[PDB]
Amino acid sequence: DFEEKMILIRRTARMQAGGRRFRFGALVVVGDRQGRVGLGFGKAPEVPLAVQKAGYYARRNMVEVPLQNGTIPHEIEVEFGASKIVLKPAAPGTGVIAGAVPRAILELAGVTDILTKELGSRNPINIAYATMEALRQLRTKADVERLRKG
Amino acid sequence: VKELLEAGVHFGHERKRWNPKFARYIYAERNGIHIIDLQKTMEELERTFRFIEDLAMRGGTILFVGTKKQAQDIVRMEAERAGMPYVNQRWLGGMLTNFKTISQRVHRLEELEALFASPEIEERPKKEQVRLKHELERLQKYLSGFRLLKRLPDAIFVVDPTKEAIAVREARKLFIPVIALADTDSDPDLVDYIIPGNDDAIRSIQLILSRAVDLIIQARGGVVEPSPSYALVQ
Amino acid sequence: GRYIGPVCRLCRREGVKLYLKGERCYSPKCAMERRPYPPGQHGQKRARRPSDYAVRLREKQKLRRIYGISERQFRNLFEEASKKKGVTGSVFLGLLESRLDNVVYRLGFAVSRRQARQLVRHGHITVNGRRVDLPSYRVRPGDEIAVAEKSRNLELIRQNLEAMKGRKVGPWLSLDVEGMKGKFLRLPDREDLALPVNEQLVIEFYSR
Amino acid sequence: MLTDPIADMLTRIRNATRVYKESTDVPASRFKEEILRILAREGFIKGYERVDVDGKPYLRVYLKYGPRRQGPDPRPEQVIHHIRRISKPGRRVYVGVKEIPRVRRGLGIAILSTSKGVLTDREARKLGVGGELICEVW
């Protein structure tokens, strides 16, 4: 079925009179490794709970990735807020040459040869969100044909 | 079914609190007030009713939302007149998107509809029979016609897409087709199947919503005489 | 051979049997059977999520300890396969697998690579009938790897090709059990190699 | 006075599409015209036309979008997602036939003026010419 990776876990803090109160965030990707991935942000009281909850959220908002032989149809850059991911396609053998955050995402979609650059801020939450918006934006020769056609 | 080249009340409403996206459906600004293109009301009316028809033919349910007081009754009757859920009082946030939870508020209503029968509703404290007969009448208040839904609706019939504009959002996010009685102060784009008309003066909200169910139960085999409020609208 | 030292502690650390010694690694006596945890004091304590980095390291070591190559020797092989034309993961294996020391192992002249590295530095091995005493010599295809005429009967190589009577040798090698000849037919293909290692991971490690 | 009129048109377009207009007037010039011809051929615009907004000549450009979508925000997909000036005044940009851009692995064009006329990236490659890289569209 779906594999899950979990790109990051964090421990946030809120202020209470006498003492500060905690919680945990969990970024997780899920993918089938043949063209579907989803990114989940799961915040909650206990770690394994928010990991689990993140998984669930990630199964909404999937992206269908157009893998053309383990890679990308074209190249995009996406700026998500102050982060910027740059995806560039590659020929077989190249492997996923990418950060840790976008490797997790890309790998679970099935991309097996890609070039990648993180630019702007490096906040993994945003970089992930951007990697995803990148995959979301990939068109293929076929979709582009449908668009222009009259 | 149409009421063709006819304008008994259909047309223009709203002054200059419009939305310029709605400008394709405007004929003129007849003395401080836009007038809805009589044609295009009928033009949309055709396509949309065909959807409403075809969907009820397949058996699915339509959620009627109408919170504004001008239609706060026309909604309840015409929706009881078919096997459809209505939302009449106020639109609870989450009724759509948090259905699995706003549902199990009905599993307390139906559980308390019958709970007025048991031999121990006179036994077990009288101070706790008070919040369990007033609560019941609050669930009967809001979840009046929401109880009919046992699962998400297939389409949703909104009177003022701008007043009950949360319900338009909620459908949208769950991918439920938005039908609406849209009028000048509303975004045409957020409506999948629009009826460009009016959502006040009661006359127009009856003529449209009545005809709505006329095509519904026509497709539910039945085909009945007017059973509504043609005079009960004054 | 090279490295030199307790070997089964490596079998143990990589959590996989690596077979760094021929016989015995088929007995119920390789430590991995009935002692399969890492070596040392904290062998049996539970583990922690090894980092991304950690994973790539071990996966490399696993490969690299399988062949008994050094690392400057190994890195050079991978670097060459990198520059080289073709797919760099699979090609790397082919270069490893083309080393005389290992080709001798494969043809079952030696029971393991460590022993095969000896048989070579000690000139018991011929390539195209001329003594090659270099364990890292690269055997191209067509070449014929023999046992040296005047070696052709030590207590060891006799008993070692005795077992090779009726055993099968890789698709990419033909062997002659009689004259103790044997041939390198083609650079082994990735699929041929049943290596307990994801060679891909290894590529990630070297591009850190 | 518009400093760059090719860019004002590329933009006028971009601004129109982004709010899903029907069409839009750009003031007339053979060159601008010469370009839109290409946009049409490759399907980025339905068409252009030589209308005449009050006395002086314009080019009504008619826009083409996607179909309506389902979800929150139905607004259709642009056919022209991206359209940018490459060579601008005070930084002209000429490429030889050997270094004409491959735009989006070819799911998009680049428009260049050459001595053989205004051509696409694939058009100039056949004809074997370079020129002044005017804009990419994809």
Add this chain to the structure above:
RNA sequence: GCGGUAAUACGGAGGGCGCGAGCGUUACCCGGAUUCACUGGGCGUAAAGGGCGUGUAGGCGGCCUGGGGCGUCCCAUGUGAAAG
């Protein structure tokens, strides 16, 4: 960033990791640094709009036609030693 009497951060020990006739240190150069940004950044509050004008040189320059062909593009050709 560790050490303020239970230190996986100091010193020793056992154990482990990495390389191995080498292993470390220091020094220096490019990299990561889109951190001088042509590719490839910025200036309301993070550093950054000149106190405002007038205007010199300079940069930039609407629509149509024709000449030249300086930029630009194309073909052929000469040159681009050896080593690397």
Add this chain to the structure above:
RNA sequence: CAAACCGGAUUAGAUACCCGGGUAGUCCACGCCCUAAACGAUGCGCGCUAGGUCUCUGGGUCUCCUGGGGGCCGAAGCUAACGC
């Protein structure tokens, strides 16, 4: 009217805040100085991209249209956010 200054108070102290005086200065002419939270902390120019509304000032068929200017709310959009 008021830096400095001279007194009176207040205070632990009071070179201060409060009180009574008080010169330069604040004023005018002419000549310097050239600074600033010289602020919209937002260079100038031109084109394009929903609308509502309040206001100053023109014009036309003056319930309304059409300019120039000053505010507010807001479409798309932008922004680290605030916000624009």
